[PDB]
Ligand binder design. Structure first.
Ligand SMILES: Nc1ncnc2c1ncn2[C@@H]1O[C@H](COP(=O)(O)OP(=O)(O)NP(=O)(O)O)[C@@H](O)[C@H]1O
Ligand SMILES: [Mg+2]
Length: 398
């Protein structure tokens, strides 16, 4: 049990809060505000306790220098709308401009700083950056579960200078995942998909230690499929990870862990709605020209079968390009198959930005045991070791 924002006196204090506002933005408008809304409880609570609140967050992965497209300005506007209260935005991470703003902050006021990653020290956990930030406040609140797997200046760095306590989101996430992390009822099935291959493939070696079956879909299926010889065609494959994929399929066998790959795919030459799609089999090969964009009808049946008896399901990654209705069936049917197990008593967890968006799109949000956008953080949590952004928080004592 970590100390939470509830275990400290906030009245009159300056609280620097690390939140995960790493949301999708298009033309200066937040496309998906799930992460912002998830953080609201914590923010509203601090404001009512009469604290002066400073928010810190990253957005994307800037080179370590400013880029208008990665600015947190659109997020401050959205937060203001959601909160129903003006949010002050300072387009700076360090400096007099930042000191001045924090200085003129009244009780029950919120200030959001610019993208933490515009500073090179952030991802390096630079002690000088962390010290400056710690100097602006009395307490540090870590509510950024989605970034808990990263040891950065804003979430881990600052904690070594001032007390660091958990916010409500961070609390809820840990409370839930801990059940599944230590005592997972079997069969425990993991479902991986999505396009962010290079980031997820590494968790497989560890997940392989506690899971019974691992179903792979999304674009990830092709790095594994190609590793097995198969003609992927035009499909997205992560060249630099093929050799690892080969070692993982091999190791899974030696360890009695079943890795289920797709048998058929819905392909199409273009990635736009309404076009002509043809369901092909992988053994038959995907002709250079057609790209795999969703798991086919056969795989949907296979995955359903392999899921039918699961007592614990962890899902991260859309099965196909669910954004375009033409290639969303794999995702919908899998989501439906998993939501059904929940009613039958299985513990079901959805983690990942688009996966959460996917369940929302189908009206399934309340059909799973737990839904999270902290996609990478949750997969790593399941591995058992304490995450750096969780370890940095004060233990609750007496
Ligand atoms: N076969 C496919 N080819 C290309 N893109 C795909 C395919 N299937 C799924 N994707 C895309 O990958 C995206 C989902 O990516 P990803 O970011 O890895 O998932 P996520 O649920 O957000 N997980 P995380 O990043 O771990 O929070 C969506 O834009 C999908 O359309
Ligand atoms: Mg994602």
């Amino acid at each position: 049990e970590k100390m939470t924002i509830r275990d400290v006196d906030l009245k009159g204090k300056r609280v620097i809060m690390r939140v995960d506002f790493n949301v999708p933005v298009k033309d200066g408008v937040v496309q998906d505000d799930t992460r912002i809304r998830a953080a609201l409880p914590t923010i509203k609570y601090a404001l009512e306790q009469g604290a002066k609140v400073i928010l810190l967050s990253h957005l994307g992965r800037p080179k370590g220098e400013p880029s208008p497209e990665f600015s947190l300005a659109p997020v401050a506007k959205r937060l203001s709308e959601l909160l129903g209260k003006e949010v002050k935005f300072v387009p700076a991470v360090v400096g007099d401009e930042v000191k001045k703003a924090v200085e003129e902050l009244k009780e029950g006021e919120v200030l959001l700083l610019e993208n933490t990653r515009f500073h090179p020290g952030e991802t390096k956990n630079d002690p000088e950056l962390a010290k400056f930030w710690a100097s602006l406040a009395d307490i540090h609140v870590n509510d950024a579960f989605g970034t808990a797997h990263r040891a950065h200046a804003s979430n881990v760095g600052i904690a070594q200078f001032i007390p660091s306590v958990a916010g409500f989101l961070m609390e809820k996430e840990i409370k839930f995942l801990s059940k599944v992390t230590y005592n997972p009822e079997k069969p425990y099935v993991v479902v991986l998909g999505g396009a962010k291959v290079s980031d997820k493939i590494g968790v497989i070696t560890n997940l392989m230690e506690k899971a019974d079956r691992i179903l792979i879909g999304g674009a990830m299926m092709f790095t594994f499929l190609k590793a097995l010889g198969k003609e992927v065609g035009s499909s997205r494959v992560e060249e630099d990870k093929i050799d690892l994929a080969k070692e993982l399929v091999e190791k899974a066998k030696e360890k009695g862990v079943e890795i289920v790959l797709p048998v058929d795919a819905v392909i199409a030459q273009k990635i736009e709605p309404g076009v002509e799609k043809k369901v092909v089999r992988i053994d038959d090969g995907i002709p250079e020209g057609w790209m795999g964009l969703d798991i086919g009808p056969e795989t949907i049946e296979l995955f359903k079968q392999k899921l039918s008896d699961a007592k614990t399901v962890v899902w991260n990654g859309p099965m196909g390009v669910f954004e375009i209705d033409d290639f969303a069936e794999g995702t919908k049917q899998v989501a439906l198959a998993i939501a059904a197990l929940t009613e039958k008593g299985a513990i079901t967890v959805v983690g990942g930005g688009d996966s959460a968006a996917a369940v929302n799109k189908f009206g399934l949000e309340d059909k799973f045991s737990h839904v999270s956008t902290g996609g990478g953080a949750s997969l790593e949590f399941l591995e058992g070791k304490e995450l750096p952004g969780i370890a940095s928080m004060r233990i609750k004592k007496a």
